[PDB]
RNA sequence: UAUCCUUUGUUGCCAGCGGUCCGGCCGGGAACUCAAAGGAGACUGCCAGUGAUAACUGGAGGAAGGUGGGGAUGACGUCAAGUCAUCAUGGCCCUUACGACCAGGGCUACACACGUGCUACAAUGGCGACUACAAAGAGAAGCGACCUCGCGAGAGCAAGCGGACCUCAUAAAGUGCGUCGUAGUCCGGAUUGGAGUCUGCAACUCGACUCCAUGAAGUCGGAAUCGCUAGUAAUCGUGGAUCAGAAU
């Protein structure tokens, strides 16, 4: 069934099925089933409507999806706008050398590539 | 450093004479010193290889 | 790419006392001249003042800052930002 | 009833000392249960013979710790006097 | 029977004979349930059909290497029959191990497949060079 | 190293008896295993066949037989083989500098090419719990029982041994029970983000390791070519030398 943000674990145990989530893993898979009181050896197709309900609400309170990916993008954007080499490394569109990369470097690059 | 090496000061603070510690004479490291030589584990080795330490010799197998 | 090998540099006149203050927590802001030194664990949480060449600026070291030199957080030149200089 | 276990690294220095311990006690006291070998714990090393290549070489080495029993029963005053006074072997560790 | 004792060894990978005999006897059981015949009888016939009689060898006789037909010895026919039956079984697509052996022992009696293709190919190579028959050897 | 015997035993074992918190543990005794030393033992001698002989072939006896099996050992000489940076040595050459100290930088720089290696694709399998057997080795500031804190690495505390009586150890596969279905998957682990431990004066190009997250290529491979005949191949795990620490 569907729990968090876009996830459809089908035909598998309650444990391994939840392991397919970007946020929770094995450690979290066991603790959640123990808190909601659910058999870990039961398939997702054998779970009742009441069991899944208590599973969604609890697993709900967690961090996942886009909102998290934007936090990552921002983290890479902050050191990118500054004078940090690591940020320039993320781009790697910078000079790898020791001569100039800005111009006159076609002897290694080859034909001019589109901007 | 120059501030931590207050050990050089013969007279300890409020603490009893027991306050006086050790500190290496060469590097000035308090971690692991060797009373006999007063040098740290790092300096005793460097001084050993150089041969500046009399009577000292590298043990062999 | 940066360079280290296995000989990270930490001026002894800014690494031994910084450990002193560790006797019972930390100590108020300090001031070091050699920005060449690199930032490491112990220095976390403390406020070290780096010399820009004119004065000492308070640089609150953080775990995320660990690894970079003290000089990287102490700008040499001074640009006003001729404008509304917002954000 | 005094048992004397003699252990050492060198096999010869033991036969010398052990034999002496017996011969000397053979007079003053009993004939002793006789000096014996006992199990010898062996320590071996397997390092490369040649420093390079010839990976297929690395000879075998061994450092043995021999033991002895002797065991002298019916000890007399002179039986011990013949022990305490004379002691040559240095590579032999006695245990009476 | 020594034949069965020999067939259980070729199926023994890593020295697990206890499990090996488990799949063997489980195959003869399902073999009698699928076919109305004694497991033993259906077993022997399966090995008999997979055996060559004349093998052609290569020999340099003066100028070039000629192919001379020769008779095979009874000691090699038993090994090949056993080996080609287990290899063909591991070729089937049924997950059940005991089922791959039961079906193979049945098809081996019916006769048809790759093992048979090799039998015909060898039978064809022979007689094709009957002009070299006088070299019976 | 393989069989046997003699000498010897705080290793061994009710083999035999007694006690047993039934752990050799204790009493006790050396048989057995083992440990160590010495010694015994194959030599074609016997039987049949062939042969001029040597010897070859078959067979019995026998723990092993025809040099039973593994080591060290490498002829006159060759390539003017390698090393004068191991060392020694003839000639030649330099002696403010091709000597010395110190601070700071690389060898692990890449569009590519090669050699030598490693890890792979499963259910005669992977995983979790429980549980049964090995040998050879290492340990002084070192191996680290046990306790406590932490998911863990590890940390604090701390017994014992100096060691065939304390520790490294848990042996792994194996066995019993349960779980997983053929899809790039609970196959496979690359790469990358975050956090942390440890060694070291100090690991941003240059560490190893632990945990979380991510989780690629790969579904077995175009022309040639390599390793082996028995407890060996193949396969699985373990200890050690070098050593503070990149050994696949």
Rounded to a whole number of angstroms, the distance from the CA of C17 to the nearest CA of chain B is: 6
Give the separation between CA B30 and CA B1, rounded to whole angstroms. Answer: 11
- Write out chain B residues lying below 8 Å of C15, CB-based: 1
CA quadruple B16, B18, B21, B25: dihedral sign = positive
Residue in the structure block whose two tokens are 């112990």: C42
Q: Which residues of E28-37 are buried (b: 16+ CB within 10 A; e: fewer)?
A: bebbeeeeee
Note the CA–C1' distance, E6 to F60, in angstroms.
33
d(CA A23, CA E85): 51
- What residues of chain C lie within 8 A of the CB of A89, using their CB? 1
- For strand F, which residues in window 5-44 of chain D come within 7 Å by CB? 5, 11, 33-34, 36-44
Distances in Å between the alpha carbon of A47 and those of A1, A14, A33?
Answer: 9, 9, 12
Burial class (CB in 10 A: 0-12, 13-18, 19+), A50: exposed
Tell me if chain A has a CB within 8 Å of the CB of C6: no
Q: Are D35 and D59 in contact (CB under 8 A)?
A: no
Could you tell me the resolution of this structure in angstroms?
Answer: 15.0
Quickly count helices (H) and strands (E) in chain C: 1, 3
**Hey, what are B51's tokens?**
């041969």
Helix, coil or strand: residue D41? strand
DSSP 8-state class, residue E130:
G
F chain positions with any atom within 7 Å of a protein CB: 8-11, 34-37, 72, 104-108, 110-111, 123-124, 136-138, 151, 163-164, 173-175, 179-182, 186, 193-196, 200-206, 211-215, 239-243
The residue with tokens 């320590």 is D43
Radius of gyration of chain C (CA): 14
- Nearest-nucleotide field for D40 (CA, C1'): F35
The count of C-alpha atoms lying within 13 angstroms of the C-alpha of B44, restricted to the half-sphere facing its C-beta, is 16
A96 touches strand F (CB under 7 A): yes
Experimental approach was cryo-EM
Say if residues D65 and D7 touch (Cβ distance below 8 Å). Answer: yes
In the 15-74 segment of chain A, residues within 7 Å (Cβ) of strand F are 16, 20-28, 41, 72
List, as ranges, residues 8-37 from C with C-beta within 8 Å of B: 12-17, 19-20
Neighbours of D50 (CB within 10 A): 11
Residue in chain B lying closest to C14 (CA): B1
Chain B nearest-CA distance from C44, in A, is 19
Query: Do the beta carbons of residue A14 and residue A25 sit within 8 Å?
Result: no
Chain C: residue whose CA lies nearest to A87: C1
Determine the Cα–Cα distance for residues A63 and A21; give it in Å rounded to an integer: 11
Neighbours of A16 (CB within 10 A): 13
Count, residues in chain A: 115
């Amino acid at each position: 069934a569907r729990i968090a943000g876009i996830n459809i674990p089908d035909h598998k145990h309650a444990v391994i099925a939840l392991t397919s989530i970007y946020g929770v893993g094995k450690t979290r898979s066991k603790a959640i089933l123990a808190a909601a009181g659910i058999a870990e050896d039961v398939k997702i197709s054998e779970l009742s409507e009441g069991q899944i309900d208590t599973l969604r609400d609890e697993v709900a309170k967690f961090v996942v999806e886009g909102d998290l990916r934007r936090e990552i993008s921002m983290s890479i954007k902050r050191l990118m706008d500054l004078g940090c080499y690591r940020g320039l490394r993320h781009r790697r569109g910078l000079p790898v050398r020791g001569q100039r990369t800005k111009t006159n470097a076609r002897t290694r690059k080859g034909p001019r590539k589109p901007i | 450093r120059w501030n931590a090496v207050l050990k050089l000061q013969t007279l300890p603070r409020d603490s009893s004479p027991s306050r006086q510690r050790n500190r290496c004479r060469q590097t000035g490291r308090p971690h692991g010193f060797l009373r006999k030589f007063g040098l740290s584990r790092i300096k005793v080795r460097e001084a050993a290889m150089r041969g500046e330490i009399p009577g000292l010799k590298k043990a062999s197998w | 790419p940066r360079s280290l090998k296995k000989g990270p540099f930490i001026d002894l006149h800014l690494l031994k006392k910084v450990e002193k203050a560790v006797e019972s927590g930390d100590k108020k802001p300090l001031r070091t001249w050699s920005r060449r030194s690199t930032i490491f664990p112990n220095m976390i949480g403390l406020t070290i003042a780096v010399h820009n060449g004119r004065q000492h600026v308070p640089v609150f070291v953080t775990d995320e800052m660990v690894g970079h030199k003290l000089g990287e957080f102490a700008p040499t030149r001074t640009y006003r930002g001729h404008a509304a200089d917002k954000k | 009833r005094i048992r004397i276990r003699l252990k050492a690294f060198d096999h010869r220095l033991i036969d010398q000392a052990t034999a002496e311990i017996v011969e000397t006690a053979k007079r003053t006291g009993a004939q002793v249960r006789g000096p014996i070998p006992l199990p010898t714990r062996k320590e071996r090393f397997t390092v490369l013979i040649s420093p390079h290549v010839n990976k297929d070489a690395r000879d075998q080495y061994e450092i043995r710790t021999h033991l002895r029993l002797v065991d002298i029963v019916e000890p007399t005053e002179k039986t011990v006097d013949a022990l305490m006074r004379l002691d040559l072997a240095a590579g032999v560790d006695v245990q009476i | 029977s020594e034949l069965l004792a020999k067939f259980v060894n070729i199926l023994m990978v890593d020295g697990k004979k206890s499990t090996a005999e488990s799949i063997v006897y489980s195959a003869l059981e399902t073999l009698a349930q699928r076919s109305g015949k004694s497991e033993l009888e259906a077993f022997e016939v399966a090995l008999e059909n997979v055996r060559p009689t004349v093998e052609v060898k290569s020999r340099r006789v003066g100028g070039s290497t000629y192919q001379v037909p020769v008779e095979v010895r009874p000691v090699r026919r038993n090994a090949l029959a056993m080996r080609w039956i287990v290899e063909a079984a591991r070729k089937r697509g049924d997950k059940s191990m005991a089922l791959r052996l039961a079906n193979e022992l049945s098809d081996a009696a019916e006769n048809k497949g790759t093992a048979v293709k090799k039998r015909e190919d060898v039978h064809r190579m022979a007689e094709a060079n009957k002009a070299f028959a006088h070299y019976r050897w």
